[PDB]
Amino acid sequence: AAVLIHGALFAVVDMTLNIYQVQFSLTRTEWYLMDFSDYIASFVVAIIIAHFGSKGNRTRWIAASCILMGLESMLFAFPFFTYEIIIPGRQSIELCMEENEKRNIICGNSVPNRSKCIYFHIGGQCIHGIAGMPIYILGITFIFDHIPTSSCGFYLAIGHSAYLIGYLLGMVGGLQNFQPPPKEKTVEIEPAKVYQLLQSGWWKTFLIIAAISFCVSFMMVCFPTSLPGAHKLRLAKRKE
Amino acid sequence: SIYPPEFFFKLLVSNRGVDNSTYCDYKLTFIVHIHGLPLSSKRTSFIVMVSTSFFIALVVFYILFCL
Amino acid sequence: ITPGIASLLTGAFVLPGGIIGHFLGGLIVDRLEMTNKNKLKFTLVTTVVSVGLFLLIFFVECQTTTFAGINEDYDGYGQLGNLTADCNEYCDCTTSLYTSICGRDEKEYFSPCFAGCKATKVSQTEKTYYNCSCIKEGLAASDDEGQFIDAIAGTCDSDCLKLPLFFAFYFSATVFSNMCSIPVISIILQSVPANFTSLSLGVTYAIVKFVASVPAPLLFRLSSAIACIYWDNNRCGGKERCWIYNKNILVY
Amino acid sequence: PLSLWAGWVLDSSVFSKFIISLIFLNTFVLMVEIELMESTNTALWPVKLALEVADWFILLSFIVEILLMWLASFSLFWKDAWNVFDFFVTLLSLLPELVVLLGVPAHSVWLQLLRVCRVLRSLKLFARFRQIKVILLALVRALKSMTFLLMLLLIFFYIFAVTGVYFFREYSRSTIEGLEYNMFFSDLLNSLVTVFILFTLDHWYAVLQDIWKVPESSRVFSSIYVILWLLLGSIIFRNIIVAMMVTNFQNIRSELSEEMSHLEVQYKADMFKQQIIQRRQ
Amino acid sequence: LLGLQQMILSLTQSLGFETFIFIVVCLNTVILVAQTFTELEIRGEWYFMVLDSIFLSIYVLEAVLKLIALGLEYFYDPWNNLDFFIMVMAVLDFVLLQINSLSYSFYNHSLFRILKVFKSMRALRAIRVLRRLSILTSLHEVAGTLSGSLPSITAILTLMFTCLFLFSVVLRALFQDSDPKRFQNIFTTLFTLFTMLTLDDWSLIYIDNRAQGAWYIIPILMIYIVIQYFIFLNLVIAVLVDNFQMALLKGLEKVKLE
Amino acid sequence: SVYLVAALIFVLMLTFISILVLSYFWYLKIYRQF
Ligand SMILES: COCC(CCO[C@H]1CC[C@@]2(C)C(=CC[C@H]3[C@@H]4C[C@@H]5O[C@]6(CC[C@@H](C)CO6)[C@@H](C)[C@@H]5[C@@]4(C)CC[C@@H]32)C1)COC
Ligand SMILES: COCC(CCO[C@H]1CC[C@@]2(C)C(=CC[C@H]3[C@@H]4C[C@@H]5O[C@]6(CC[C@@H](C)CO6)[C@@H](C)[C@@H]5[C@@]4(C)CC[C@@H]32)C1)COC
Ligand SMILES: *[C@@H]1O[C@H](CO)[C@@H](O[C@@H]2O[C@H](CO)[C@@H](O)[C@H](O)[C@H]2NC(C)=O)[C@H](O)[C@H]1NC(C)=O
Ligand code: NA
């Protein structure tokens, strides 16, 4: 349940980052940098939390890393709502005239309020990896140290696949809204109408996604520190 | 009376706007006899539910007539 | 295949191999309680046949396919880059979003508006272009109803059957990959004491993002342009949009 | 453990249930195949390939199982009648795949009947039924009894066919503008099939009247021929077969009854033999 | 549940309940044999529908009361199972009639008639009446020996149907568009083979094919006739004769027993 | 549609040979018991 929304989250973001680059007047240089932010964020926590997961309660740390998923996912949706004015075709009225066509594609006031979002986005990618990685470390560690060997792979598989099934629906559920409405084919309003449905499309999606990462964390916090299941097995594996 | 009910239908056969062949508006009024009319569903159910209520009443009393 | 559609094809089809690859792959060790020697034999033959499946895919790439554009200078009427002719300027064609459109001569024309199409009537289920001036004679039988003669947006494909061979070979390679993951991860637990298994996941997970995912894009990026040599040098500038992703070099 | 592998797998009961499932399914998928090459739809395109791939799936599965029996023994594989016949059938059913991948001779009448042979397999499926075995063995054993009767029938088809060629020659060599059965006695093969038709008592009187419709072919030889074939061939001989088969059922009853008697008499001797040792103790 | 059901029983198996129901069933069958002339059914149509609704109510009475009396033991016996199926058909055609307009287009609708024949099935109950009065058991012996013969009759019958079915499949595969009037459909292939199995006009289909299509059908049809009429039906005759022979030996030993 | 159909078969024929192995190693587990 923690992994599924974790799987559901990332798959959306890759396209969300990708479409953000193309739509919002970026270069292909910055997009990898936003992508790179998730990668290194796990790397700077793949070791630190592992040293910290050894010393303390695994259950507490995961839900906290589940909590920071909730903060991250909505944060990655604030720029879409706040900055829906970045680059529509004609909504930057100060500089584009509704009757002139060259005016409507120049005077790039979109590159401001763009790098501001990238700070929301580089933060959105960094909080993803810093918090996402302990979920995939500590939880499986709890699978290692509390579940017998002969069924860990049965649990190792489902955890891997619960990340895969979110790789599916992160594209499948997300793209049905990003992919254009029944009207692909009207006059140029549609690029100015498709623009509304992608930022609002993710601002809708991440609002529900992030809150789920909270309620799942709240349930794990209520889970015992001293797991009664392992204590029965620990005495079984302490003797003999 | 005995036999199925019978009805009479006075029906009119006209030719007013349909024909371009002639000036004559043939207006034939004639009566037909129709016998063999069929049982109404209302008359059919009304037999059933008023007959079941009777034969049920037959058994129930004769259940209590044995005690 | 349309880049939006092409992205879906891998996304909606690599998972069905992947999910069971862990499910069948993991349950093999779990049901059989496989040993350390057993899994190593299990991993080897798992990958060996997979590579021959990748090799099988490579053999499939050898087969010829229909070719659109990249026919060297446009039929003798202009060179690569003529593309900016008169009909480019009138309908305001922009060299970044250019897509190939098919003419009735089976010849594939890029930038449907560059095809000289001064009119476009769009139906409910398709996009079509009219008065296509910059087209060559073409137009053998053509067709239409409310209108006569016109060219249809998008690429035209007559031999895409090879596609079912490609995924089929792609699925079973994917399954073998996901049933290689379980054997490697399963062994790591065994050779580490119970208290130290917590730091075991971190050691391998540190190599995941740094040693692999940091140098990888650069290795792709350099060799991505190697097959994308023919960049749109006239407009895009510093390698923003290519036009000839070398269909023979990239495969090799 | 190489032949042991094939021996083991060919022994699993769920595996055999599966393969009989395959036989039932190929039988019933060849059915709906020949029905559904109708161009009256486009939603039928999606099931065409499904049925075709099921076809080749069951086919190649037959090949893999045959190779499994090779790997098992390879030696008695040519001694069991059913297994060797199945090899024959699968061979002659995979021959169509070759003749279509070559397409040399034509897409003609011989081709279609080579395909349909598949369903033949399902015969084995009914060997598993309990009485069918009894009726069939008795049916094969009785057929063995009346072996020479069939040779008398063959002689009499020879007789009546090659004399019906000669009796009715002006009839087959006739010019009457209106006739129906002007062919039945044309040549020898037509004469033999005609003798069969008369043997089945179908349209004997109509053919006889047709013969009479020629002013030639005296009505005392055609009549005698037809009536003597109908009496002798069609009523007696058809009845001797039934008599013989009833006799064979009576025989089978007799041996079963006598063996029951022998077992009961042995049991009575046992109940007499058991008291002996009881007394001897 | 012990006194109410029990009195329902002791009123159900009562020697008057049975006679009342058999009177009903013999009246229904005399009506049902009245309705097969068209000189009486057309006249007395309005009274017959009234009487048949009456009979439907009576059968509601009997079926519900018997079910309440004897639990699933009612479903256990097949004589009643016949009655329950007849009941289901009656109630279904009743509701279908009410959910349609009783007119000519429904008189000539095939499903109306099909639902009507199952009403004819009520006449089967009449045999139960004939059983108590007695059939004289004059055919008790023939019925008993047919009863003995059936286990193998079913087996040979299904074997010959199987042969029919295989030949029908192959004939459909081969001889399309050579007289499509006969077997253009699988079902009409199968019926053509079945009607060949009675040997009526079987040469006609050979001639018809030979006229426009081709004659390869002659070895197939000759082999078909050989197998089915010549070796299968004679098996039915043989097994019946043997069964009645056993019946005769049983009778001989039984009469010598006295 | 030959390639399309030739795909589905190679998907299954492949998986069927995989099933051969799974029982085999399962049978390699219980064969020494005999
Ligand atoms: C004398 O006492 C006998 C009693 C056992 C009675 O068993 C009965 C079970 C129901 C059964 C099999 C019996 C007789 C008529 C049978 C019906 C005749 C009809 O025939 C069919 C089939 C053939 C069709 C031509 C007509 O419809 C079926 C629909 C109908 C039928 C076969 C349904 C089943 C009925 C026998 C034991 O007593 C101690
Ligand atoms: C006295 O107790 C006997 C009881 C065993 C009773 O077995 C019964 C099994 C059903 C059976 C075989 C019996 C009698 C009538 C048989 C029916 C007569 C009809 O005949 C047919 C065939 C012939 C046609 C002319 C008419 O229809 C069949 C459709 C119908 C029939 C053969 C269906 C089968 C019936 C005997 C054991 O008790 C201890
Ligand atoms: C472009 O296509 C349109 C229709 O798709 C053609 O329509 C004609 O336009 C001219 C304008 O010069 C009118 O005078 C004609 O009456 C139009 N035809 C019809 C049938 O309405 C137009 O011809 C095409 N352009 C060219 C250059 O041929
Ligand atoms: Na006849």
DSSP string, chain A: -HHHHHHHHHHHHHHHHHHHHHHTT--HHHHHHHHHHHHHHHHHHHTHHHHHHHHS-HHHHHHHHHHHHHHHHHHTTHHHHHTTTSS-SS--TTT--TT-TTGGG-S-TTSTTTHHHHHHHHHHHHHHHHHHHHHHHHHHHHHHHHS-HHHHHHHHHHHHHHHHHHHHHHHHHHHHHHS--S-SSSSTHHHHHHHHHHHHHHHHHHHHHHHHHHHHHHHHHHS-SS-HHHHHHHHHHH--
Residues forming beta bridges with residue B30, ordered by sequence position: B11
| Position A103, amino acid | R
Rounded Cα gap, residues A88 and A199, in angstroms: 11
Give the number of other Cβ atoms within 10 Å of residue E99's Cβ. 8
**Six-digit token pair at E84?**
């329950």
E47 → chain B, closest CA residue: B4
- Angle in degrees, CA A12, A13, A14, rounded to 5: 95
Cβ partners under 8 Å of residue A1, min gap 6: A216
Q: How far is CA A124 from CA A128, B12, B43, in A?
A: 6, 86, 78
Pairing of strands C100-102, B6-13: unpaired
- CA E206, distance to chain mean position in Å, is 33
Give the number of the atom of ligand 3 that is nearest the alpha carbon of residue C130. 5
Question: For chain E, how far is it from start to end, CA to CA, in angstroms?
Answer: 51
* Sign of the torsion formed by the C-alpha atoms of A67, A69, A72 and A76: negative
- The residue whose two tokens read 């033949």 is D120
Q: What is the resolution of this structure in A?
A: 2.9
Say if residue A177 is exposed, middle or buried (CB neighbours under 10 Å; 0-12, 13-18, 19+): middle
- Beta carbon of E198 within 6 Å of any ligand 2 atom: no
Report the distance separating Cα A132 and Cα A72, nearest Å: 10
In the stretch 1-34 of chain F, residues with CB closer than 8 A to chain C read: 1-4, 6-8, 10-11, 14, 22, 25-26, 29
CB E119 within 8 A of CB E28: no
**Is residue A54 within 8 Å of residue A142, measured between CB atoms?**
no
Cα–ligand 2 centroid distance for C44 (angstroms) = 69
Is the CB of C133 within 6 Å of ligand 3?
A: no
Euclidean distance between CA atoms B5 and B39, whole angstroms = 10
Angle, helices A189-222 vs A2-23, to 10°: value is 150
Nearest to B4 by CA among B31, B30, B34: B34
Whether the Cβ atoms of residue C156 and residue C102 lie closer than 8 Å to each other? yes
Q: Which residues contact C75 (CB under 8 A, 6 or more apart)?
A: C136
Nearest residue to C176 (alpha-carbon basis) of C53, C10, C13: C53
Chain F adjacent subunits, 3+ CB pairs under 8 A:
C, D
Q: Which positions 23-42 of C are in contact with F (Cβ < 8 Å)? A: 28, 31-32
The Cβ of residue A120 has, within 10 Å, a number of other Cβ atoms equal to 17
D232 touches chain F (CB under 8 A): no
- Decide: residue C123, CB within 10 A, 0-12 exposed, 13-18 middle, 19+ buried: exposed
**CA B38 to chain CA mean position, Å:** 5
H-helix or E-strand containing C102? Answer: strand C100-102
CB atoms within 10 A of CB E160: 19
Q: Do chains D and F touch (3 or more CB pairs under 8 A)?
A: yes
Distance E247 CA to ligand 2 centre (A): 15
**Phi, psi (degrees; rounded to nearest 5) at D174:** -125, 155
Distance of CA C92 to the CA centre of its chain: 29
Determine whether the shortest distance from the Cβ of C47 to ligand 3 is under 6 A.
no
Per-residue tokens: C80: 């690569």
DSSP structure class, residue B40 = P
Distance from the Cα of residue A143 to its chain's centroid = 24
Separation in Å, CA D61 to CA D33, D124, D154, E15: 19, 17, 44, 66
Phi and psi at C114, nearest 5°, equal -65, -15
Q: Is A165 at the interface with chain C, CB within 8 A? A: yes
What span, in angstroms and rounded, lies between the C-alpha atoms of B36 and B39?
A: 10
Tell me if D176 sits within 8 A of D191, measured CB to CB.
Answer: no
**Which tokens in the block code for residue A125?**
């990618």
State how far the Cα of A147 lies from the Cα of A181, in Å rounded to an integer. 48
Give the H/E segment covering residue C37. helix C36-61
- D131–E contact, CB cutoff 8 A: yes
Instruction: Show the CA angle centred on residue D19, arms to residues D14 and D25, nearest 5°.
Output: 125
B39·E49 Cβ contact <8 A: yes
CA distance D139 to D142: 5
**8 A C-beta contact, residue A174 and residue A30:** no
Q: Which of D214, D223, D206 is nearest to D174 (CA)?
A: D214
Using CA atoms, how far apart are residues D50 and A45, in angstroms rounded to an integer?
Answer: 51
Give the number of other CB atoms < 10 A from CB of residue C163.
Answer: 15
Q: Which atom of ligand 3 is nearest to the CA of C118?
A: 1
The residues, ordered by sequence, that sit 6+ positions from B66 with a Cβ below 8 Å of its Cβ are: E7, E11
Q: Backbone phi, then psi, for E71, in 5-degree steps?
A: 50, -135
CA–CA distances in Å: residue C210 to residues C102, E114, E115: 45, 78, 78
Residue type, E105: S
| Nearest-10 crossing angle of helices A2-23, A58-75 | 30
Query: Could you tell me if the CB of C130 is within 6 A of ligand 3?
Result: yes
CA distance D186 to D165: 7
Written as six digits, the tokens of D146 are 């009346």
| Distance, CA of A38 to CA of A18 (rounded, Å) | 14
Give me the sign of the Cα torsion angle E61, E65, E68, E71.
Answer: negative
Q: What is the DSSP letter of B35?
A: E
Q: Which ligand gives the minimal distance to the CA of E89?
A: 1
Cα(E241) to centroid of ligand 2, in Å? 17
* Angle made by CA atoms D259, D265, D268, in degrees to the nearest 5: 145
Among candidates F1, F7, F25 on the partner chain, residue whose Cβ is nearest the Cβ of C165 = F7
Which residues, 6+ apart, have CB-to-CB distance to D171 below 8 Å? D182, D185, D211, D214, D216, D217
| CB neighbourhood size of D57 (10 A) | 19
Q: How far apart are CA A141 and CA A155, in angstroms?
A: 11
Q: How far is CA D201 from CA D229, E199, E201, E235, F5, in A?
A: 10, 8, 10, 20, 52
Measured CA to CA, the distance from residue D192 to residue D236 in angstroms comes to: 19
SS3 B32: strand
| β pairing state of C108-110 and C117-119 | unpaired
CA of E82 to the centre of ligand 1 (A): 8
| Rounded-to-integer distance, Cα B11 and Cα D53, Å | 67
Distance CA D259, CA D281 (A): 33
- The rounded distance, in Å, linking the Cα atoms of A88 and B23 is 75
Using CA atoms, how far apart are residues C27 and C32, in angstroms rounded to an integer? 8
In our burial notation (b when 16+ CB lie closer than 10 A, e otherwise), range C81-111 reads eebebebbeebebebeebebbbbbeebbbbb
Distance (Å, rounded) from C-alpha C93 to C-alpha A190?
Answer: 18
Q: How far is the CA of E146 from the centre of ligand 2 (A)?
A: 6
Nearest Cα neighbor of D121 from D211, D59, D47 is: D59
Burial of E198 (0-12, 13-18, 19+ CB in 10 A): exposed
DSSP E strand boundaries for E164-206: none
List CB contacts of C239: < 8 A, sequence separation 6 or more: C225, C228, C231
Question: What does the alpha-carbon distance between residue C113 and residue C132 come to, in Å, rounded to a whole number?
Answer: 8
Q: Shortest CB distance from F7 goes to which of C28, C32, C167?
A: C167
Torsion angle of C-alpha atoms D96, D97, D101, D102, degrees rounded to 10: -30
SS3 content of chain F, % helix, strand, coil (to 5): 85, 0, 15
Handedness of CA A157, A223, A129, C7 (dihedral sign): positive
Round to whole Å and give the CA distance between C101 and C110: 5
In the sheet that holds C151-152, the strands lie side by side as C108-110, C100-102, C151-152, C128-132, C117-119
Q: What value does the CA radius of gyration of chain F take, rounded to a whole number of Å?
A: 15
Contact F13 D60 (CB under 8 A): yes
For C165, the closest of F3, F14, F22 (CB atoms) is F3
First to last CA, chain D: 55
Q: Which residues of E touch D250 (CB under 8 A)?
A: 242, 245
Token pair, residue C206, equals: 């540190």
Q: Decide the pairing of beta strands B6-13 and C117-119.
A: unpaired
Find the distance separating the first CA and the last CA of chain A, reported in whole Å: 36
Asked whether the beta carbons of E89 and E118 are under 8 A apart, the reply is yes
Experimental method: cryo-EM
The separation between CA A224 and the C-alpha centre of its own chain, rounded to angstroms, equals 28
- Alpha-carbon dihedral sign for residues E190, E192, E197, E198: positive
Task: Report which of C133, E46, C218 is spatially closest to residue B40, judged by C-alpha positions.
Answer: E46
Identity of the amino acid at A112 = P
**Backbone dihedral region of A128: left (phi > 0), alpha (psi from -120 to 50 degrees) or beta?**
alpha
